[PDB]
Amino acid sequence: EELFTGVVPILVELDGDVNGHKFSVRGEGEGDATNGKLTLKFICTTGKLPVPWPTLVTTLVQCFSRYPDHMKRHDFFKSAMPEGYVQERTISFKDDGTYKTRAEVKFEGDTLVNRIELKGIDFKEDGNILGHKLEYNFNSXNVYITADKQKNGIKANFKIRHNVEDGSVQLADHYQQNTPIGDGPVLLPDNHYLSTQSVLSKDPNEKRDHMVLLEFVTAAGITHG
């Protein structure tokens, strides 16, 4: 019965901890899955953020992807709602540290809500992350999604290339698992991918450390006939 017909509003709240630097982020926006489009505004609610906003983009809602008319049959993310789903990820940054995230994504009335715990261990103090040496952009990936028979959900891995201010690239190898919150009702997709493209900006008026994030996601990689 998985119904994202509207433009559904979105809350994101993350609580985080990197090398003992506690912090909290809040995101409000809206998303239209019909058009694979979404818009979001993230504020760090503990003053200054201790890492680059781009490292958090993956972590900070794949229910919003456009799945073309013939591919609805393979949209786990939606199928799993409103009960929702759990998205766990381990993100290792080559020659630097690591993130564990665990996050619960679900409806709460009108709103789609993504609540996340993130803990980052052992990052170099003059590293590219801890030292905010990363360009404020985010390059696009086509993420491959594959059914997990056993845990009754999906998994994914991919390497994000973050651009560094000196002209080099910071690898962030992502590994991800999703598992529904409820029991009984979900769609397990044959492999396919999610092309996802992102634009980071700033609000002219916003005093707090923040990110504006526009984002466009469509699914493809099944074809038929």
Author numbering: 5 to 64, 68 to 232
Quote the study on this structure:
The structure of the DBCO modified sfGFP148azF (the first such structure of a SPAAC modified protein to our knowledge) reveals an induced conformation change that drives the functional switch potentially opening up SPAAC bioorthogonal conjugation as an approach for modulating proteins rather than simply labelling them. The simple strained alkyne molecule, dibenzocyclooctyne-amine (1, DBCO-amine) was chosen as it is one of the simplest commercially available DBCO compounds and can add new long range bonding capability (e.g. H-bonds via its primary amine and triazole groups) and is membrane permeable (vide infra). The quantum yield and overall brightness at the optimal 490 nm excitation significantly improved on modification (∼3 and ∼6 fold, respectively). The triazole ring lies ∼45° to the plane of the aromatic side chain with the octonyl ring puckered to form a boat conformation. The overall structure of sfGFP148azF+1 is similar to the unmodified protein. Linkage of 1 to azF148 through the triazole results in the phenyl side chain rotating by ∼90° around the χ1 dihedral, with the aromatic group remaining in the same plane. The loop housing 148 also shifts to a position similar to that occupied by original sfGFP, regenerating the solvent channel and interaction network through to the chromophore (vide infra). A putative H-bond between the triazole central N atom and the backbone amide of K166 may play a role in stabilising the conformation of 1 and contribute to the loop shift.
We have used superfolder GFP (sfGFP) as a model system to exemplify and understand mechanism of action of these two different nnPTM routes. SfGFP26 is an intrinsically fluorescent protein derived from the original Aequorea victoria GFP. H148 plays an important role in defining the fluorescence properties of GFP through the contribution of the imidazole side chain to the charge transfer network that modulates chromophore protonation state equilibrium, and maintaining local structural integrity. We have demonstrated the versatility of genetically encoded phenyl azide chemistry to positively switch protein function through two different non-native PTM events: photolysis and bioorthogonal modification.
